Design an enzyme around this catalytic site. Structure first.
Site, short mmCIF file in Angstrom:
data_model
loop_
_atom_site.label_atom_id
_atom_site.label_comp_id
_atom_site.label_asym_id
_atom_site.label_seq_id
_atom_site.Cartn_x
_atom_site.Cartn_y
_atom_site.Cartn_z
N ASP A 119 -57.41 26.70 26.25
CA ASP A 119 -58.51 25.75 26.39
C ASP A 119 -58.51 24.62 25.37
O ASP A 119 -59.50 23.93 25.21
CB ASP A 119 -59.86 26.47 26.40
CG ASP A 119 -60.82 25.88 27.42
OD1 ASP A 119 -60.41 25.19 28.38
OD2 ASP A 119 -62.05 26.02 27.28
N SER A 138 -70.73 24.60 9.59
CA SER A 138 -69.39 24.37 10.16
C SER A 138 -69.42 24.14 11.65
O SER A 138 -68.57 23.47 12.20
CB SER A 138 -68.52 25.61 9.97
OG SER A 138 -67.94 25.62 8.69
N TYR A 174 -71.08 13.00 -0.35
CA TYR A 174 -70.60 11.63 -0.55
C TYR A 174 -71.22 10.68 0.46
O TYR A 174 -71.33 11.00 1.64
CB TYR A 174 -69.08 11.56 -0.43
CG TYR A 174 -68.34 12.31 -1.51
CD1 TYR A 174 -68.57 12.07 -2.85
CD2 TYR A 174 -67.35 13.24 -1.18
CE1 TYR A 174 -67.89 12.79 -3.84
CE2 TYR A 174 -66.67 13.94 -2.14
CZ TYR A 174 -66.93 13.71 -3.46
OH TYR A 174 -66.25 14.43 -4.43
N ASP A 198 -59.12 21.72 8.57
CA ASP A 198 -59.63 23.07 8.60
C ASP A 198 -58.50 24.07 8.39
O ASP A 198 -57.52 23.74 7.74
CB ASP A 198 -60.34 23.27 9.96
CG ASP A 198 -61.49 24.17 9.87
OD1 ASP A 198 -62.63 23.72 10.14
OD2 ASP A 198 -61.30 25.36 9.60
CA LIG Z 1 -73.02 12.00 3.09
CA LIG Z 2 -62.54 24.89 29.43
#
Ligand SMILES: [Ca+2]
Ligand SMILES: [Ca+2]
Ligand SMILES: [Ca+2]
Ligand SMILES: [Ca+2]
Lengths: 51, 274
Positions: free
Chosen positions: B41, B220, B170, B32
């Site tokens: 965190d 996402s 894919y 990403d």
């Molecule tokens: Ca796939």
């Molecule tokens: Ca936490």
């Protein structure tokens, strides 16, 4: 919109839509800027948010 | 104080965590925009960058940090809670601060993850065409035992048109679509034969730079719930193959409607981890 760092084929899949001057909703700024490049810069931003 | 994002109970990850399985000793790579490793965190134990001029452990976009928090936000007294809060979390930066990237960067990240023994790869990203090298890289990852998960796409529906993008399309990759807190498909969620399962992707609350939290929408946001779920399964059944984990996720999903729109439905990690 500064689309100078485009084109780039891959974008995040965050949905944060932009409405182009073509009345098409682009999923996010990355998608929009790729479209601006495809249009040779004729596409502009109408407004943030879906069309 | 810690709050529990709605996706955790919706996919039944809280039930599996309560059994004592939280993803410990499972390596998950988030491919990403980076992850803000200094976030209180998150616990990012490694990674790599394939974006020139950017480090693996910063995130100038925010997306990667949010995705990572859905997988792995720490179980503690603050912030939120990930699906698999004990995973070994790796930041593999393949997109820049603008949220964009090259196929070659992504390929390099998938290869790095495979070489470095990741158990799960999350790709909350897509493109219209894919590339030969991207197909090769995901096929290699999956064949060598990595569960590969990707956001299906945010291209909505239009008649019978398949709107799944790559790498989700894919066959070696689990394509994940988005539902909301009512278990309804989000209108932006891509559709098609390759759509495999659904997870929460609307109004998802997670970590965000700098040291904060945000609510985002997209497939996402759905993908990391499935990546986390794969990690929970592997932490409970560590000798399962990638294909076995994948099959558990799809075969135990809660049916929501036509597979064109919902795949097998909403993942249920409690059933998948039985
Ligand atoms: Ca796939
Ligand atoms: Ca936490
Ligand atoms: Ca930290
Ligand atoms: Ca399907």
């Amino acid at each position: 919109v500064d689309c100078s760092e485009y084109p780039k084929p891959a974008c995040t899949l965050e949905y944060r839509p932009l409405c182009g001057s073509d009345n098409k909703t682009y999923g996010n700024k990355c998608n929009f800027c790729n479209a601006v490049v495809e249009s040779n810069g004729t596409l502009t931003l109408s407004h943030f948010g879906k069309c | 104080a810690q709050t529990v994002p709605y996706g955790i109970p919706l996919i039944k990850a809280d039930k599996v965590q309560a059994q004592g399985f939280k993803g410990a000793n499972v390596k998950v790579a988030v491919l990403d925009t980076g992850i803000q490793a200094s976030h209180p965190d998150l616990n990012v134990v490694g990674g790599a960058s394939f974006v020139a001029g950017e480090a693996y452990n910063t995130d100038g976009n925010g997306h990667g940090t949010h995705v990572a928090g859905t997988v792995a936000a720490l179980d503690n007294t603050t912030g939120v809670l990930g699906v698999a809060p004990s995973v070994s979390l790796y930041a593999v930066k393949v997109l820049n601060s603008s949220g964009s990237g090259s196929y070659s960067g992504i390929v390099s990240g998938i290869e790095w993850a495979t070489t470095n023994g990741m158990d799960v790869i999350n790709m909350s990203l897509g493109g219209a065409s894919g590339s030969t090298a991207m197909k090769q890289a995901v096929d290699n990852a999956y064949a060598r035992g990595v569960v590969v998960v990707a956001a299906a796409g945010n291209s909505g529906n239009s008649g019978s048109t398949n709107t799944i993008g790559y790498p989700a399309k894919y066959d070696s990759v689990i394509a994940v679509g988005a539902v909301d807190s009512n278990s309804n498909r989000a209108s932006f969620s891509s559709v098609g034969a390759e759509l495999e399962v659904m997870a929460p992707g609307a109004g998802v609350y997670s970590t965000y730079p700098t040291n904060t939290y945000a609510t985002l929408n997209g497939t996402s946001m759905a993908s990391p719930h499935v990546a986390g779920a794969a990690a929970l399964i592997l932490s409970k059944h560590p000798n399962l193959s990638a294909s076995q984990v994948r099959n558990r996720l799809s075969s135990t999903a809660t049916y929501l409607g036509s597979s064109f729109y919902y795949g097998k439905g909403l993942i249920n990690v409690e059933a998948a981890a039985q």
